[PDB]
């Protein structure tokens, strides 16, 4: 026989996961973990299954960073260089995709008939959300805030929502948590959009993104077209970036955003309160996580 | 309430599938679904499950074109621009990853529990294949040709096998067709390597820096001449550099060496087919014509 | 004194007009001065003032080519390189702005006080035209075709009208020719849009990202397909992308739609001409041949 | 009728003037205004006409910045981003040209038979001056200082000279001021050339300009060709820029320049004195403006 | 000891001469060694020393191609890619400088003490030549044509003379051939200038910005037109710009002027040859055929 | 006669040497000079010949910088801009080559039958060393440390070795010094490789060089391929550069290097001691030069 099929080896696996291993060694904020833990105060998933869910969500989150950073044309990730800047675009892209499949083999280990539908519908919402955001970026067409919120619902829903639904599906109780979780994802994103601009310097302007405050500033005076024109230019320069910061303060767009985040956080606390009144323990950890996204 | 979640709309699906629909409408050889039918002479999968397997395999293949064209940095696909030169690399990449997911939602329609293990395990091979090839590319390390075929079995076999393993999961017959069908994916790829240089642009595997089959043979046949491998490093677009490499590769008798190997492999494919038939199987004309349309 | 001011010299004028002289010497259709004579059959402007109007219109037109070729980022002009690819974009732009001023010094020779209001008010239209077109380009916003013609009247009419309004200021006849002459500048532009794609490079309006007439029709005829408008975004130089768009634009029956519109417009131009003649005007052969050399 | 011609609208006008409005909102030095005002101590143009002259000169000056910055390939303008870096080259270029025409419609409002000839000959000198400067830049051919001074006479004459001549032509008195004004423009430019190099860092070297001190340094030792070669390179880098600063001090080119500016300022004060002796008030404001361009 | 020094190996020489071997194997006119033999009819250098002179001259010439192709930024050499587009500019440059040194080690085999003064003094001319040409290029300063020939004598004569001066150092005859042989290197270069434009790419001296002979004549024949010299500034690759310059250079009757000058120079070469022969020298057919193969 | 051959002129010579004159005016470390002087404590070359040797080695060293900086694609040289960044690549390249020939005319002045063979074999080793280093850089193939040391032996041998051999060949005594000198060159290079990374910021990573510590770090864990991938990217950015610094400390590669340099310096001091015991003066200056390359 001319062809003899060899076995996969630790060394080859080390190559394929090089960019994934790279990203997992940078220190980051434990966000996904704390949210899982604070919901487990209520769902009490068994330790063996909760570990599986926690591994799947860790893999999925990192592979998503490998691909987002490429699609968003990013420069830094958790303070260190973005992974395609070390390994090149192709290998980073392929490491992310390999990991999507590996996580599917992991979620098979729950042995739950409904698991794979939950995983599919979550990843469809993810891609759907990132899809609409790229469409607006690529066409210079500023969405409305309702439109943005629906998009981020799928984007920063997809993966929060996947974790909580895998948890719900492995737990005895039947309380529907995902409306709460979607609100928490939307808050988290609007807080991220703000911090990206007030804390590289304003990297969302480099990437051309119609983020939540950028939308308010563009719509609040459509006679002026300076900010939207800047987004088209995708500037690397700190003078243009600084100039747009200044224009966005002058439209009161950061006050507007702090304002919205207050309204949403109230809605979340009511939803949490209305849930404990129906026979769930008081959750401290979730109130704490909700203070952690604060401006 | 402040937030009111909306229903995904047909206009929005149109945007998400912009790149996918565009690639789908360019005409192609469609040699994947001819192979599938050729095998359905033996496994006799009912029509309503075959449509699903065809639909799933076609989706995955268009998806991996969207993505691999970005990865390999191609210029043309089926004589026309790569999707990302029209839609940009980000929307094209997301549309790819989108379709990978709709493919998984679709394979669930078989309602066969072996189906998910088969789908997952074949895509893992596809990535291992693509992964080792990019690795050899980016390190400027020429692999051996056993290493090359190992990689190619995973990569171009990965989704030939997906199609047949799914078919075997809907058939009751207890015969392993997979070794046959991998041998065929190798032949298909080695042909594609040869045809890339002697017949998607002038020699786009040179522009890509891909260590393809004849390039491998020509590099290793004389390692004291590093003209060929240094040309891969420069990823040339110039027709002058490409034509010189092609001429170097001729004087190494590499194109002959390739023609030679695919002939030994086609014989091995025929034997393998005749063995299957001598174990109570119909004589298969269509599979033999598939193997012959795979030639030069 | 330390500073002693010098006299501008013929060698220095040669440098300032380097780009202008270069463009002037490439042969052109010269359809502007044929239109001017065609109208002088009715208005009978004396020879010595007509030479000035011709000189002024020719200058302004070459000036706006120097400048608009930079703006639109063209590659060829009259089959030859754009002036700025030879002299650089700064000297070419200044030579343009220089000539705009010598044109104003020249229109003062008519010694007609209406002349300055006419000159200023037509250049303001030219800029409004060019301004709205660049705006639609740079925002990736497809205008409607009423919006398109409004823009085109200002832009390609702006300097047809300059030529005739100046002529009417030296004639005593009390007949408004301007509506006729704007209708003609529209036809001339819609022809130019069509000829840019079906006949200055292969489809340079695609490379420029210009929302031209048939491109507009093809984009709006099916807004669930964003292939065309995304191709404008990429400003392609590749012949492969340009040829695909051209092929997309065919299947929308846009080239037919254009041929159609210019036919309705040529009829409207003929009627308008015959009306003017039925009010005590000589029958004009030359204007009708101008309208026919404007066709496909 | 197939075609119906619409009217121009506030919105469309807002688009066309976007880059012009942008530049007018950045704070700058009130130079042109103060010079007009200090000459009005002598010419006493009527308020209604002086406002017209002041508007025309403001428009003309800003549109000239829109186009110079493009032609000079500039990065910053009054500390903020250059306008074609926000709006793109074409729209900025076209905004400048539209404004040249609008200002011509404005100078029509003086209703003066001689106004338009003054405006034409001023703008011809402007373009003539910038024309010769680009020619030297583009051909790597260092002019002589006499040649430079004639060029800047037209360049920074054209627009100073336009304002004072429009003023003279609207005033009762007949004293010829433009020889004084040309000297004041030359001083202003030589002072600008110095400050560009001693106060982005040395942007005249990025743009390849043969400025007044750069000329002295290149000619003072033509055996060395380092500085002229640097101009050909058009460097964005601060090491090359720093190196040329150092070479220019070693040829005593900044001392030479301070020297010239002293000689010229004397000539200006004598011209001002010789003018008051013939029956004009003592002008404080012009002596003050002349102290404002000091090194 | 910690450090143990190794012996240079044949595999390592192969890498160092990678670019040199590559250039050597492309076929060339080999007009240098035909000139050498033509002169050996008079000087009768023994075979074993002539082989060394040939070997040394061939090495230096290939070395200076490796290096000057980087300097001038060429695209093709002998119809094929420049070595640095394959090996990179650093290895190609080092291989050049390497061979310069092996050439010096080789000229030591003559064991002639005049040989080192001749070798050093001719390479110093080569650099002075290349140096003044780059200088005129990079300052955009057109030289005069006396300045041009002064430069060319150093540059293209520098290594014609090396070959003959070495030959005269092994012959006993007391006749100065060098003035003849420099005149011939000038003719060879002026031909090469003309053939670069009228016959290594379309007009690669335009793309390089080289002030070659006809370009010089055309620039200076009318200094109030700066189209030609501004085109040199842009170093155009576009065929459209190159073709326009070529057309400008025609209307200056520069190609005629060149044909003219090489005819006066060929006459001067013939006279010079006949004078040498009238001082007791064999009639030389081969040198006259060399001079005729140098023509258009 | 149509052609009249002119003479070379001071002015033309000034042009050709412009980039060479430029480099000689920047202040640098007197390394080559001090090593020559400290060996002359032993060889006592006559003043007239030692000056010739000292001129040849100065020329050769500077012309080598003109060409290395081009081949290594360098940005700074002795703190000031690299010479091809001022004069362009071609003129810098040609200035270096002209100077190689001029130095050959200089070494003719020793009038020594053996001089020119010494010069040839030294410059062959030079090119041979730089040749192998470019080969590894260009092929992403990490050498072994033995292989690196042989390469640097020829590279930083060639020119140290040329000076000492020209000296030996002009001196009465017959003690063979070049084994000592080769060790001193290897030390000097390993010290340079270290300082390039711990003192532009890490320019050896920009240039893709397999320097001594970079080799140890790549080989010490071939499972990880981050550092070698970075070399392929040739980064100008300080985040990637910083990230690789951090990875190299974590493999103890700088400790390893200090370690080696200690071992070699001992070997050198023994060689120096073993030489004085055979009837040579005690050399202070060479012990001092050996303390000057210290980490």
Swiss-Prot record, chains A, D, F:
Organism domain of life: Eukaryota
Record motif DDXXD 1, residues: 68-72
Signal sequence interval, chain numbering: none
Annotated binding of isopentenyl diphosphate, by residue: 29, 32, 61, 78
Motif DDXXD 2, chain ranges: 192-196
Disulfide bond residue pairs: none
Region (Geranylfarnesyl diphosphate synthase (PT)): 1-295
Residues binding Mg(2+) 4: 68, 72
Positions with a binding annotation for Mg(2+) 3: 68, 72
Residues the record lists as binding dimethylallyl diphosphate: 77, 155-156, 189, 196, 209
Transmembrane parts of this sequence: none
Family: In the N-terminal section; belongs to the terpene synthase family. In the C-terminal section; belongs to the FPP/GGPP synthase family.
Description of its domains: The bifunctional copalyl diphosphate synthase is composed of an N-terminal type II terpene cyclase (TC) catalytic domain and a C-terminal prenyltransferase (PT) catalytic domain which are separated by a linker region.
Role according to the record: Bifunctional terpene synthase that possesses both prenyltransferase and type II terpene cyclase activity, converting isopentenyl diphosphate (IPP) and dimethylallyl diphosphate (DMAPP) into geranylgeranyl diphosphate (GGPP) and further converting GGPP into copalyl diphosphate, respectively.
Subunit structure, as described in the record: Homohexamer.
Protein name listed in UniProt: Copalyl diphosphate synthase
Organism: Talaromyces verruculosus
Source taxonomy: Eukaryota, Fungi, Dikarya, Ascomycota, Pezizomycotina
Encoding gene (name): PvCPS
Residue window of the full protein shown: 660 to 961 of 963
């Amino acid at each position: 026989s001319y062809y003899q099929r060899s076995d996969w080896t630790a060394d080859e696996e080390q190559i394929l996961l090089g960019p994934f291993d790279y990203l997992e060694s940078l220190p980051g904020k434990n966000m996904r973990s704390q949210l899982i833990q604070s919901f487990n105060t209520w769902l009490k998933v068994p330790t063996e299954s909760l570990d599986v869910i926690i591994k799947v969500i860790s893999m999925l989150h990192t592979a998503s960073l490998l691909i987002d950073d490429i699609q968003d044309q990013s420069i830094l990730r958790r303070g260190q260089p973005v992974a395609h800047s070390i390994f090149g675009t192709a290998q980073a892209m392929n490491s992310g995709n390999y990991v999507y499949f590996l996580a599917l083999r992991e979620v098979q280990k729950l042995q739950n008939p409904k698991a794979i539908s939950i995983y599919v519908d979550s990843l469809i919402d993810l891609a759907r959300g990132q899809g609409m955001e790229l469409f607006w970026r690529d066409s210079l067409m500023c969405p409305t805030e309702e439109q943005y919120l629906d998009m981020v619902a799928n984007k920063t829903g997809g993966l929060f929502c996947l974790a909580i639904q895998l948890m719900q599906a492995e737990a005895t109780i039947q309380v529907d948590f995902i409306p709460l979780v979607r609100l928490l994802g939307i808050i988290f994103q609007i807080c991220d959009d703000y911090l990206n601009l007030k804390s590289g310097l304003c990297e969302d302007l480099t990437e051309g993104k119609f983020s939540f405050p950028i939308i308010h500033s563009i719509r609040s005076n459509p006679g002026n077209r300076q900010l939207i024109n800047i987004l088209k230019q995708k500037p690397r320069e700190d003078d243009i970036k600084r100039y747009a910061l200044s224009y966005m303060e002058s439209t009161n767009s950061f006050e507007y955003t702090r304002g919205v985040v207050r309204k949403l956080k109230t809605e979340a606390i009511d939803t949490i309160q209305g849930l404990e009144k129906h026979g769930l323990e008081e959750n401290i950890g979730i109130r704490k996580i909700l203070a952690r996204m604060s401006l």
